[PDB]
């Protein structure tokens, strides 16, 4: 549900290793970097 991960900078393609269909809401998000488009946001923490 959710939320996704979806963030102003996240694109929400190519999860955590790229070998899902995607994310869409973090429990992949391959980027990781805090900021842009990565995983922002996540939550509670980004970047991480
Ligand atoms: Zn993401």
Avoid: F, Q
Wanted: charged letters at 25%; proline letters at 12%; hydrophobic letters at 20%.
């Amino acid at each position: 549900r959710e939320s996704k991960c979806p963030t102003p900078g996240c694109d929400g393609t190519g999860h955590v290793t790229g070998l899902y269909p995607h994310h869409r809401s973090l429990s992949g998000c391959p980027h990781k970097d805090r900021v842009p488009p990565e995983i922002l946001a996540m939550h509670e923490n980004v970047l991480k």
